[PDB]
Write a protein that binds this DNA or RNA. Sequence first.
DNA 1: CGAATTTCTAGACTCGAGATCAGCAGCTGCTAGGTCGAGTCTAGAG
DNA 2: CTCTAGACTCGACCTAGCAGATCTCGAGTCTAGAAATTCG
Lengths: 261, 261, 261
Amino acid sequence: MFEARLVQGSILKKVLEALKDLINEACWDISSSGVNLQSMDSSHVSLVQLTLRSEGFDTYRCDRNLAMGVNLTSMSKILKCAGNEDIITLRAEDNADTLALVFEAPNQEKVSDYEMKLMDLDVEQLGIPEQEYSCVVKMPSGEFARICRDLSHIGDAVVISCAKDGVKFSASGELGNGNIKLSQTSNVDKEEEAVTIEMNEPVQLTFALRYLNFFTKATPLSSTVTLSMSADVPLVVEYKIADMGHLKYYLAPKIEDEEGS
Amino acid sequence: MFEARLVQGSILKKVLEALKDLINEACWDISSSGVNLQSMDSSHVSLVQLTLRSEGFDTYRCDRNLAMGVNLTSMSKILKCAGNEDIITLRAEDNADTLALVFEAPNQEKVSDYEMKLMDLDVEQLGIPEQEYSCVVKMPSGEFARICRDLSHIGDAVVISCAKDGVKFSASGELGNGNIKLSQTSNVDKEEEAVTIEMNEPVQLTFALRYLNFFTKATPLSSTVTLSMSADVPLVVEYKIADMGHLKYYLAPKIEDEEGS
Amino acid sequence: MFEARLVQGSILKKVLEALKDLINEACWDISSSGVNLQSMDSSHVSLVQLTLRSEGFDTYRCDRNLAMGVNLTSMSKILKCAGNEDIITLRAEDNADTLALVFEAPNQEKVSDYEMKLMDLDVEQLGIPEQEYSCVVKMPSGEFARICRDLSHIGDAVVISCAKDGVKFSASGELGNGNIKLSQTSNVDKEEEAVTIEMNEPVQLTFALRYLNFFTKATPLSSTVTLSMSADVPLVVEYKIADMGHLKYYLAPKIEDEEGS
DNA sequence: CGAATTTCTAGACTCGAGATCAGCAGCTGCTAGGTCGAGTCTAGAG
DNA sequence: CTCTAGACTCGACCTAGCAGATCTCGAGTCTAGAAATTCG
């Protein structure tokens, strides 16, 4: 039997907002120790993983692990209506093909009741292999969002250069080219200002800007975003949702020969 | 000869903002007791009644009771150019020639003025009957607006029942079914953020959500709003215009088709 | 080599988004006195002249005076990426046809470097016959912007007949007519609201308000319009660039003989 | 600092013009119109 | 009186569509979402 009580409904609001456009349908896996979400893009290049644990949840109970197939557009539409301060009372009736959602109120005089129809999908599991990443960078989410948004205007692809003098983003296009660079900040002890960089070997890659723009939408979830990559491996973008879990992104680097044509 | 000083022109601004998207023509019955307006919708489904009291205006005088037909869409278009805190002394000539507007400024430093023509139209008078209603509910207007706007995401008809503990706002859209119940609380000392119902006999009806969304456009007029309905009786929505008067909204319930057969 | 270091990049941003919708290519003149710009419009109706005195720059140097051709729409887009409080370092080097732009964070933590390509153009000298003016007014920019925007609703031709007691911004249209009148007041302690007018000869003309809508975009630069007007002379409105200089705007009044057919 | 307000922007919708297409008739000769190059008139200087 | 250079005229010369249905496309309009602003 599945029940779930959450205090900060804004967390679910932000999660569904971030996941709304990149993915439309997903297999909502549920465990007895937490919630796991892993699906894939229609264009089949980007991979998303979610790790909503159970301890952070106010009330968690799952007798048997299930797997719900649910339209993410419907979840976003429903969840946006509820306010950003209510109480989430997620509950799934066993084999009922329906997920029950209940919204309370801080003053406890108005409650919400919504029912929506599950959609049966094909469960596809892809065990992600782990490996070291040469360049590891953590830096404030807002600056990253602004950087990606600005570089969107100029061109279409970005050349990350994890140079030891500070990361130097670079773009190009028929309207000229630009390159924004930062510096390793050590004096400021504030985490919301850290530009901490981990260096193993200089690297250089390339990624489509539109997918990075899509990825940056999860900014309200947290202030700090971590980057990691290495030679010819998919990009790692990490978001930390307080303590109930972490949200990750995976983007496959472009090929240099794609610039030739 | 007609004159009417309106110190709070914003009230009439919002009034025309509300009525604009429903009925495009109206014959304005003017009397020494005040200004009257009654017009029935284009689709012949809903009726709109408006009442203005003479004593509310700072200055108001009507030698002979008047009636003019005038477009409201252009009226609203020119009103949208007015400031939110202007002073209006709406005046019209004794001869049925045109319409005069006396736009002003709070600092008495600049004055605007517009001229509009009038078109004679049929004075189609329909006898409104006066009957009591089994169920009458008062409830904060913002909550009603939010409820209707949210339910618009689901379907086109909402089942409503004046329940023992409150109301039964619910709709069954193709995507799913959602229920919203309002706890009938009267222990609240301040009546503005409170709900109250007279319960006479159980009722159950349904309406059109698009028409409700159009109905709720007048939300900033007042904090409260009164609903009234009975068996096969058209639904009554009343908006209190501060001390100017009341705005009344009419909608017959959706006829229950013999879809069961 | 040409260098320009404007501390208040907001100024350049504002002038650029003001001119973006009127000129697609304009020659740029530099001088030890300062930068100059004069460019007649695309539709061959209005003229735009801009003064950029070098004394206003925190740092300026120009060995020899060149004439560069620069697009503007691309400049508007590229400068949109600039922040609101950054230090522009506009620089063109030697005979290279590339324009260098450098943005620095106020906290000097995010160093943005850009690049623009210029193209050669015809440098056409166009004489401006200076003369005296009959209807010359000084009046707050926001009021003029609001008036023109509101009158855009009424129609497409205004007729100012500058009044002995103020102005006569009257206009008409198929819907009707509207004559906003502003009383001339000089009993203002501060100069931010004065509407002082010099009146010597009667005057009245006609102009197109689409050009006026393009015309008023420069509102954020200052707050004191210095509109001047005289017998059958092209219309002139000037905005003061804080203390650096001025931006003059030129449009010939529409000939009423062309309204015969 | 949070929320309401206002403003802006971008995407969906509609309309008018331009292009394309599947089929026909059985014809290409005529009409409008634009260009262009050469003949020729005329004014000023020798 | 005659030679010569520029503008006007005339003749020559060329050339594009031939008929309806069907998309297609580009420009204009509206609205909803976003973002900036401001005030208590």
